[PDB]
Amino acid sequence: KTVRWCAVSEHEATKCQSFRDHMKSVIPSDGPSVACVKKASYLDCIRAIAANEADAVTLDAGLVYDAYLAPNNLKPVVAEFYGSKEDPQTFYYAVAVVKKDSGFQMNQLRGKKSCHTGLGRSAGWNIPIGLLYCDLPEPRKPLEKAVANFFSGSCAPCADGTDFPQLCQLCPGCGCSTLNQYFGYSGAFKCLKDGAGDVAFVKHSTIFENLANKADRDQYELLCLDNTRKPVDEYKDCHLAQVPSHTVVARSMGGKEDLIWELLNQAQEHFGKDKSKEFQLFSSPHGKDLLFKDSAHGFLKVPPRMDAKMYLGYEYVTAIRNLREGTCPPTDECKPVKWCALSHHERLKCDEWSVNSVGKIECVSAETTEDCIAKIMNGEADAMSLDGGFVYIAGKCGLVPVLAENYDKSDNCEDTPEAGPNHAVVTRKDKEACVHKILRQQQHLFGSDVTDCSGNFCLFRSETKDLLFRDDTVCLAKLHDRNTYEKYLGEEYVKAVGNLRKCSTSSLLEACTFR
Amino acid sequence: RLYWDDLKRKLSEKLDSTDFTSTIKLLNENSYVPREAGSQKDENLALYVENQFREFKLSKVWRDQHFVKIQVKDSAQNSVIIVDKNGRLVYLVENPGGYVAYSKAATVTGKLVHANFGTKKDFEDLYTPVNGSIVIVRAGKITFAEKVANAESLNAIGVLIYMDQTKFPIVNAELSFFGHAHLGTGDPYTPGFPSFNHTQFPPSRSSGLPNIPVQTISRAAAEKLFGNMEGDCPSDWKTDSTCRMVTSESKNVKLTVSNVLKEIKILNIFGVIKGFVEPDHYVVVGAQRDAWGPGAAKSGVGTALLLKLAQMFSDMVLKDGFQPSRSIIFASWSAGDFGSVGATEWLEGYLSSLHLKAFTYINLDKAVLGTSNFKVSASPLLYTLIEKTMQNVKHPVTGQFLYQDSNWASKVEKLTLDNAAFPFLAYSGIPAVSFCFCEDTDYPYLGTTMDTYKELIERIPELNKVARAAAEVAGQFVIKLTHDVELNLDYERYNSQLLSFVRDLNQYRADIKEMGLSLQWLYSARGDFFRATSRLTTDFGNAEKTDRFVMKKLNDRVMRVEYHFLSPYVSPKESPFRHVFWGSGSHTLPALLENLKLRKQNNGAFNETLFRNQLALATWTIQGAANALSGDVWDIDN
Amino acid sequence: RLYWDDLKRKLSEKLDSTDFTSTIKLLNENSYVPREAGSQKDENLALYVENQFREFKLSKVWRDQHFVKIQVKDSAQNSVIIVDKNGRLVYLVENPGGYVAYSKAATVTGKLVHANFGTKKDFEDLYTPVNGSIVIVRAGKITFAEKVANAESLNAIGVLIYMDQTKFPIVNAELSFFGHAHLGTGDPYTPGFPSFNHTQFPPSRSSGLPNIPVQTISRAAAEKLFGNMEGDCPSDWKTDSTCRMVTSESKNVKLTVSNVLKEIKILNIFGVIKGFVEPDHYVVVGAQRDAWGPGAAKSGVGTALLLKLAQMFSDMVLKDGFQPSRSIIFASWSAGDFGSVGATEWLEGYLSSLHLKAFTYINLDKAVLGTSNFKVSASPLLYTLIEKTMQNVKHPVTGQFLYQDSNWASKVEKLTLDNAAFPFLAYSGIPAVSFCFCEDTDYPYLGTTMDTYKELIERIPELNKVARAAAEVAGQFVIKLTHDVELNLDYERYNSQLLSFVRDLNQYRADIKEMGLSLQWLYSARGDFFRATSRLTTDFGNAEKTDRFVMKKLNDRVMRVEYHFLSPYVSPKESPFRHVFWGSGSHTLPALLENLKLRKQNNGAFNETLFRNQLALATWTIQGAANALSGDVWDIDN
Ligand SMILES: *[C@@H]1O[C@H](CO)[C@@H](O)[C@H](O)[C@H]1NC(C)=O
Ligand SMILES: *[C@@H]1O[C@H](CO)[C@@H](O)[C@H](O)[C@H]1NC(C)=O
Ligand SMILES: [Ca+2]
Ligand SMILES: [Ca+2]
Ligand SMILES: [Fe+3]
């Protein structure tokens, strides 16, 4: 069936109809087809897919956050890769480009003029501003007014010109369209080369997309975190931060994830890169970065389970939400550790424990053992007990274990670890310190206790059989070693579960092993 | 256009140019010197405020007139004398100038026992039985009504209230004070329903009305009574060395009270500024206008803060361009001295019109009493809003911010019956707040005629600055509550409240088990509530703040939070304070525990049948409040 | 995309292809022959419907399980015998096969008086005093509970219920019937609160529970009793020529009932189809599943209509593309035979979750009993929706439309206690509807085991067509209620209701005047209400139907209309049916008049103090319902 598509501005609308005419020549072998919808900005495209007007449009990782929020609810289906088709990359580098012999450094950006790709875009706004927000002079909110005072002049695509006059000093009206000379990667670079701004926050491939001469490229320098400057060609050694690649988004329900990928995998072969002389999906004579990014070299399937907040990951989602609220972080006071329960019996045991812990432990509920793991990732949960197999699944996501369920009774149980593999308490990177501390405090209050539970609470005993922990557990040993999923499962067991996961694959494992 | 910080600054500037003292003194002029509710001078200040509101060019200005029944001292002055065993004897002790409204009005005679403050705990420690005898107490331990209520429970004959010199550093020992003993909010003869000619005022009597006489007497009068009494009072209670425990078997006191009830015309003056995004939703700001004596501290300051806040906000809108998302109502209540009467009539009266339209109440009464510390009692749903304001406003004397105690949330005390905010939260289910630039020790002349402007300005040199700091705190509560799409109500605050409840009830898990009862359901009830708010929190995090529709569905749910804690089962008329956490009676969470404490002593004071029900209704009530908060009915499995 | 007419047609087509009889017979199979609430066969059909709902691929399917207490006939069968003055004598009259749930269960003996139907009016006309004597009545005059209630008020000892041959044309005169005497909705041992293990089932007893034994007996059994009785019954009552007024002084009857209460596991099966514009708002459709006997007419038909309607609407969405603005919930209740128990537990249980989320209820119980006329009892707010449907649907037998009586609105009768809809409207404040393809005379074997499929299909040849016409009427109520932005609730209908009230009360203006009372306030109360709806009507007329925001603010106000008629003052637990117009007790408008009627006879039955309050609360309640409806709080001056 016909897969509608959203286009921004006239230049992209002309590339859309060309995306239509060219395709219908070799189409349709089975069914796929493309359509064209007119929209003023990307914000209009996200709102359109939610109203069923469109079906899919490519968004920047930083603009994905706005697409999955209510009521838009849009989940990415196909993500484009950068580099080559041989060795695909699911993450591009965000970097700050400046002129040579400028004098300005990363720490000294105040007063200087800026060129941003687009308000809310990874390389253009989220990463560059992300590090300056906590250094910005109050008030921090609105974040836009803070930036309008930090930089003297600036061009922020998609920004409110009426509410913020300084944010559109370089590009009046702050257009979000290709109609605006200063828009996107190549648009922010033409804002630097034109001497309008002293700095342009873009991608590492932006320098090569605009300039071809290595002699012309030496006229520019690259800013680095440690307040230094290195050759542009050294993007890997000197950059700001790594961010997820641009992906096409569609509705979570009724978005036709398969009918869109069937089109894109067939479109990259007919009108892709190094395949046709008539039409190119990543190149157009009417404009740059139309529909897709010129720096892209194809597409890749976004797993089923993987949602918007899982595609960006904890590290990045939290950073965006903190950037919009103006939150700037250790006091080592800790926060209640959110335990994840699975069954009805687990939550009941958890609830009775939450009250007994004086609020130190809280309870979050999940449907499946795999679903609790997902919540620990995005932040909805903090820790849960997992068996050897699942620890491998969780580890491949980004959760490192900190406790092990010992079963052998000894004088010093917590002090000495046990190999086995045994049940491990996986947690998130940041909440590893407190989980290590809080659960150790309960051990002295609800651990090895006389059989008087009838009156008091007992942490290891379950009303039925193995609820939050295994009943035959004596104590929770602390892993003094910075143990990961690889450092805890030895070496032979690691390869064991890996190959077994080859045939029997879960929806989570294929998600955590995607990027 | 205008963000928070731009509003904070525009407010501060307006405050700097505003002169409060001048207004507080103008309200203490000879034309407003006596404010007794329903007086010609009470109405005088009523018209003033009305015309003042109209002058501020507010979007709408209206007035409600109720015909409630108060009580007064007639031509037959009351008197307290000591008599002999056969009949009248000894000497005349005092001719009270002040009285206690809603007293039984009768003549009683009997032994006189000192119950100290009159707390239910004070009576239990008394070595002398209070049954069949007149008791004398010291005010401020608990409301006047509670002292009488606790005494009547232990079968007292009458009650005498005085002001010792320790708690009250007043030179003039002949000074008398006023108060009411109604254990109720608003008029006591239209319990649970509005006082309007509409109802024809059918015969109805509040259960909060005492069946025992209550009279106030000066310090000197009490000392005269102690001279006829023996038994040194315990050092436990910081009191005068005059204090005497009981009377001699030869002579006992004879109290005679003959107060007569009077029907008056009370006036409630309002002023409303319409919001632009949501006109129907509104926060309410009120202040007592009536006063037994001059009332500079009791009502003078508050009514002044109301006039100015209505002024400052009208200016910010008309001139500055401040755009309010939700309406703001300013109310000047009357009959306050008789128990938030004016306000409570309005609540009982337009309950249907404010069901879920009114999201918060800010009370200005007694906001300035001292200068030492900053006190605030309110609904948890405002704790965060308060905390954020404490660390935003600077103390009027010390340059430091109001946020100095991190664990201040845990030190907050429940709202009492005498507070005008009580009715709003416990009855209407509208989050209420009541802050104070209080002093470690309560204001001396609070009920005395002594509460003049001279006395206030003298005990508080920098009155104007403190009044401004006050107006500022309330001013930000308004800016925060109506400013932006998000409602600054923190439904999450309650988790601590429920955790506290369950933890205290878990202590008695031994008795629970002994009875055919399990405490597992309450553990879940609390958990389900926490997960409910968490999901709500995330639902806010995963939403587009700019989408009018998705926020309404989220802010609407948040507003109920308070409502859902009002126990549905009890009749609002007989038990108006339905809120489980802050209301009154058996239904309230405290009552459930209070009753279970009696089970530990194995005595017959504990009612098992009652407890089983107290428990069953409470657990569901917590449980149902949780099921609702989530978002939908079909989705919640458990 | 799809408009009304396109939906009407798509519904009719689905109906034509749907076979109802086949389903009604499948529910009468040997595996579902006995449905007694809580039985293994009751749960059998419960699972079936659940799996059937899940099969219809509905958006969500859940179940609630309550542990309520019903009553059953144990090993000790009850018995009715006639005895002598000194002791046992005469002969055994009958060994009842059927009983009356919630009977006092005890042995009583005394004279036997025929109270006919048992109406409060029937007792007043009796020439023979009912005090201290057993009374025998004929069912269908008023609910079984009311017959017992009215008799106990006049101090009866016990009650006997039978089915005369006139009102009941049943050949087999030995046939016995079942019923309950609880003057309450839902379980009687968890009055006013949900029955869930959560509550631990604290000791609680419904006030609707009788303190007198009640037993059912066959026609033959009663005729045997009439043989020992003298006194020809009045022709006034169309009854058998066997009927006898009273027993001879030589021999009187001795009733012995020993029913024992039993705890059972009741199951409520649900299914919800989410709307697209407003998921949270929803209309509820339900049908009783349990049945004492086979219950083809009592529950067979209804449960069948529920399954098919859930089917037809799932198809219209999944396939046809029907887009519902608001969700639709389908409920299969149990324990219905004991007084809407299953349903009422759900209402008491998720009241907070459905406060203003559930806007209407459609009941399918007893929708097909005859074929002569079409009967419907519901809230005025649905009168218009009904009228429009009556003239849209065609009678299953005669080709003419259902709209034949123009003044049908004035012939509509209140919803009764036995109707599953009653709890929804009178307790929850959710407009409810209950239509019927009724017959001038009620179904004979309604409670009898006689209510089989054979008997139903035989008394109603074209059962399938009548079932379809039924499903169609309910089907359009759903299409109308969830279809478009406007809510088909006609708040204006009530003006007639209030006008009627005031007009009847104006008749007694003489007595009103004699007492210190004026009736002017109620005149205004009604007027203010009318102007309130009129303004609402115009506010709808002056709005852009396509604007989501301006309609929510207008539809939200409309939904409350019903809620605001639920008297706030009375405790929901003791007096659950709070609605003034359709509830029970003194608070209800009828009660106010009922009591004033006693004032005309100048006897001591009239309570003045009560009336003054009945009046004061009622007038405000009408008055406050009007103030709210307008739109805002500040604007209304009067
Ligand atoms: C209201 O009733 C009072 C007597 O209680 C009377 O003095 C007053 O005039 C009445 N006012 C109205 C409007 O009925
Ligand atoms: C609920 O209580 C009943 C006894 O009334 C018991 O048989 C049943 O097992 C209990 N179920 C649960 C979940 O507590
Ligand atoms: Ca009142
Ligand atoms: Ca119940
Ligand atoms: Fe990017």
Swiss-Prot record, chain A:
The keyword Ion transport applies. It is found in: Secreted. The modification Dimethylated arginine is found at residue 20. It comes from the Eukaryota. GO terms for biological process: antibacterial humoral response; cellular response to iron ion; intracellular iron ion homeostasis; iron ion transport; multicellular organismal-level iron ion homeostasis; osteoclast differentiation; positive regulation of proteasomal ubiquitin-dependent protein catabolic process; positive regulation of receptor-mediated endocytosis. Disulfide bonds join 6-45, 16-36, 115-191, 134-328, 155-171, 158-176, 168-174, 224-238, 334-434, 340-372, 350-363, 397-512, 413-475, 453-458. Transmembrane segments: none annotated. Expressed by the liver and secreted in plasma. Hydrogencarbonate 1 binds at residues 117, 121, 123-124. PANTHER family: SEROTRANSFERRIN, TRANSFERRIN. Monomer. Part of a complex composed of SLC40A1/ferroportin, TF/transferrin and HEPH/hephaestin that transfers iron from cells to transferrin. (Microbial infection) Binds to Neisseria transferrin-binding protein A (tbpA or tbp1). Forms a large complex with TbpA and TbpB. This is Serotransferrin. The lineage of its organism: Eukaryota, Metazoa, Chordata, Craniata, Vertebrata. The gene is TF.
From Swiss-Prot, chains B, C:
Keywords: Cell membrane, Disease variant, Disulfide bond, Endocytosis, Glycoprotein, Host cell receptor for virus entry, Host-virus interaction, Lipoprotein, Membrane, Palmitate, Phosphoprotein, Receptor, Secreted, Signal-anchor, Transducer, Transmembrane, Transmembrane helix. Induction: Regulated by cellular iron levels through binding of the iron regulatory proteins, IRP1 and IRP2, to iron-responsive elements in the 3'-UTR. Up-regulated upon mitogenic stimulation. It comes from the Eukaryota. A motif (Cell attachment site) lies at residues 526-528. Glycans are attached at residues 131, 197, 607. Residues 1-638 are extracellular. GO terms for molecular function: double-stranded RNA binding; Hsp70 protein binding; identical protein binding; protein homodimerization activity; protein kinase binding; protein-containing complex binding; RNA binding; transferrin receptor activity. Changing residue 523 to A: 20-fold reduced affinity for transferrin. No binding to HFE. One of its GO terms (biological process) is positive regulation of protein-containing complex assembly. Changing residue 526 to K: 5% binding to transferrin. Changing residue 530 to Q: >5-fold reduced affinity for transferrin. >10-fold reduced affinity for HFE. Stearoylated by ZDHHC6 which inhibits TFRC-mediated activation of the JNK pathway and promotes mitochondrial fragmentation. Stearoylation does not affect iron uptake. N- and O-glycosylated, phosphorylated and palmitoylated. The serum form is only glycosylated. It is found in: Cell membrane; Melanosome. Serum transferrin receptor (sTfR) is used as a means of detecting erythropoietin (EPO) misuse by athletes and as a diagnostic test for anemia resulting from a number of conditions including rheumatoid arthritis, pregnancy, irritable bowel syndrome and in HIV patients. Canine and feline parvoviruses bind human and feline transferrin receptors and use these receptors to enter and infect cells. Cellular uptake of iron occurs via receptor-mediated endocytosis of ligand-occupied transferrin receptor into specialized endosomes. Endosomal acidification leads to iron release. The apotransferrin-receptor complex is then recycled to the cell surface with a return to neutral pH and the concomitant loss of affinity of apotransferrin for its receptor. Transferrin receptor is necessary for development of erythrocytes and the nervous system. A second ligand, the hereditary hemochromatosis protein HFE, competes for binding with transferrin for an overlapping C-terminal binding site. Belongs to the peptidase M28 family. M28B subfamily. This is Transferrin receptor protein 1. It comes from Homo sapiens. The gene is TFRC.
